[PDB]
């Protein structure tokens, strides 16, 4: 049904957001990367 | 109960306070005329007030040198090395007979290890060096060999830890325990964590 | 722990900036980009 | 030329004998005591401002026409800040003592107050109070600061 491009696009978008945040500020976030970790794990689950 | 800690709210405005050096002290070393101290952590020092008690006319300090650095070490002897790893903070000259001195730092210094040197001494050479009072029984002993004829004890030995400084016969500070006879020095700090 | 992490991040960023500036000033064709007084505060670790 | 070189000599350290004699002949030559005090104040402040400008010159901070521009994004070091602070503390002391002379300077040399305001953005948080004190002495006034201190 075409969920692989969806997950890939989500991963690329959140990585771009992470880079944009990294360039500008220096604040901390204890939950950073949780969504990306989950999406990558889901993609691996679809791929194995 | 907040997920993202707010830098505005976790950082209040802590004011400066008067702390005695020995309370932050962790480790020290003493040589003939220099003193190395390590604190529990880092501190923003603003003023250092130094008090002198039980001073002797024979010798005291004319110029005091203060050094600092913000590199954490586990052994004092490692950081005892003179030239490479210190930053000078202030040079203070003392009029004769001073008991208290106010080393005012124009900029507060962030430091973890500190260094105090007696750069120059106002000295009284009228003291008799050929004949010295015995540290044990107060008997007059000649300089050579320095062994008392009343009790058989040495003169160059420390009055506190009984260590003989064979290198410097008359050191300002003891090389083993750091006992000083010429004066007793106390340190204050206008600092904050 | 958050304050300690923030201090470490600040110093690491300042060292990276100094190293990059030292590498850039070695090049001759590339001219140094001037910053106004406000741009310096925007760029430096002052506004962090 | 007499007042110039004479005040230049007074700031040079020497034995107190020549300093006392030179002060006496200063208070003689320069009309009256207010005049010699004003001349010393103005000369000292001009020298201090030149020192500050050269110090910032050394590290890439350039005041071209009225804008202060920086070439390096890296902050300044402790020695630079201490050398800035000595000059600024002398200026702040005199401006807090006799504000009229400081105001007269700021009138004659128009690129001082704006330079201080621009440089306050580049120096760390430990040097902002003295710069703001100079700005307040120039603009807010002396009697206002005295009333505020009450
Ligand atoms: Zn004896
Ligand atoms: Zn001893």
From Swiss-Prot, chain A:
Name this polypeptide is given: E3 ubiquitin-protein ligase UBR4
Family designation: Belongs to the UBR4 family.
Function: E3 ubiquitin-protein ligase involved in different protein quality control pathways in the cytoplasm. Component of the N-end rule pathway: ubiquitinates proteins bearing specific N-terminal residues that are destabilizing according to the N-end rule, leading to their degradation. Recognizes both type-1 and type-2 N-degrons, containing positively charged amino acids (Arg, Lys and His) and bulky and hydrophobic amino acids, respectively. Does not ubiquitinate proteins that are acetylated at the N-terminus.
Subcellular compartments: Cytoplasm; Cytoplasm, Cytoskeleton; Nucleus
Pathological association: Episodic ataxia 8: A form of episodic ataxia, a neurologic disorder characterized by episodes of poor coordination and balance. EA8 affected individuals have attacks of unsteadiness, general weakness, and slurred speech. Additional variable features include twitching around the eyes, nystagmus, myokymia, and persistent intention tremor. Inheritance is autosomal dominant.
Disulfide bridge map: none
Species of provenance: Homo sapiens (Human)
Quaternary assembly: Component of the SIFI complex, composed of KCMF1, UBR4 and calmodulin (CALM1, CALM2 or CALM3). Interacts with E2 conjugating enzymes UBE2A and UBE2B. Interacts with RB1.
């Amino acid at each position: 049904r075409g969920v692989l491009p969806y997950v890939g696009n989500l991963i690329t978008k959140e990585i771009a957001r992470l880079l944009a945040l990294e360039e500008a500020t220096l604040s901390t976030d204890l939950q950073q990367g949780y969504a990306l970790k989950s999406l990558t794990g889901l993609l691996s689950s679809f791929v194995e | 109960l907040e997920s993202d800690p707010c830098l505005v709210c976790n950082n209040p405005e802590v004011p400066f306070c008067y702390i005695k050096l020995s309370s932050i002290k962790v480790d020290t070393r003493y040589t003939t005329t220099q003193q190395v101290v390590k604190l529990i952590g880092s501190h923003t020092i603003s003023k250092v007030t130094v008090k002198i008690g039980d001073l002797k006319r024979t010798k005291m300090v004319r110029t005091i040198n203060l050094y600092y650095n913000n590199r954490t070490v586990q052994a004092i002897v490692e950081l005892k090395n003179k030239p490479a790893r210190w930053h000078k903070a202030k040079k203070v000259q003392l009029t004769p007979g001073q008991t208290e001195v106010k080393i005012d730092l124009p900029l507060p210094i962030v430091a973890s290890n500190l260094m105090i040197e007696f750069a120059d001494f106002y000295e009284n050479y009228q003291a008799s060096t050929e004949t010295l009072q015995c540290p044990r029984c107060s008997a007059s002993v000649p300089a050579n060999p320095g062994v008392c004829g009343n009790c058989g004890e040495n003169v160059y030995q420390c009055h506190k830890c009984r260590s003989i400084n064979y290198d410097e016969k008359d050191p300002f500070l003891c090389n083993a325990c750091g006992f000083c006879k010429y004066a007793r020095f106390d340190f204050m700090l206008y600092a904050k964590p | 722990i958050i304050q300690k992490v923030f201090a470490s991040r600040k110093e690491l960023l300042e060292y990276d900036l100094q190293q990059r500036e030292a590498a850039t000033k070695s090049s001759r064709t590339s001219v140094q980009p001037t910053f106004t007084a406000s741009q310096y505060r925007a760029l430096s670790v002052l506004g962090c | 030329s007499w007042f110039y070189f004479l005040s230049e000599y007074l700031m040079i350290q020497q034995t107190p004998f020549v300093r006392r004699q030179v002060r006496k002949l200063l208070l003689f030559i320069c009309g009256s005591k207010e005049k010699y005090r004003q001349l010393r104040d103005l000369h000292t402040l001009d020298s201090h401002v030149r020192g500050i400008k050269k110090l910032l010159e050394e590290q890439g901070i350039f005041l071209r026409a009225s804008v202060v521009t920086a070439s390096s994004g890296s902050a300044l070091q402790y020695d630079t800040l201490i050398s800035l602070m000595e000059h600024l503390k002398a200026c702040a002391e005199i401006a807090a003592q006799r504000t009229i002379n400081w105001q007269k300077f700021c009138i004659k040399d128009d690129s001082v107050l704006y330079f201080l305001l621009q440089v306050s953005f580049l120096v760390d948080e430990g040097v902002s109070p003295v710069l703001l004190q100079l700005l307040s002495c120039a603009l807010c006034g002396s009697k206002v600061l005295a009333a505020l201190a009450a």
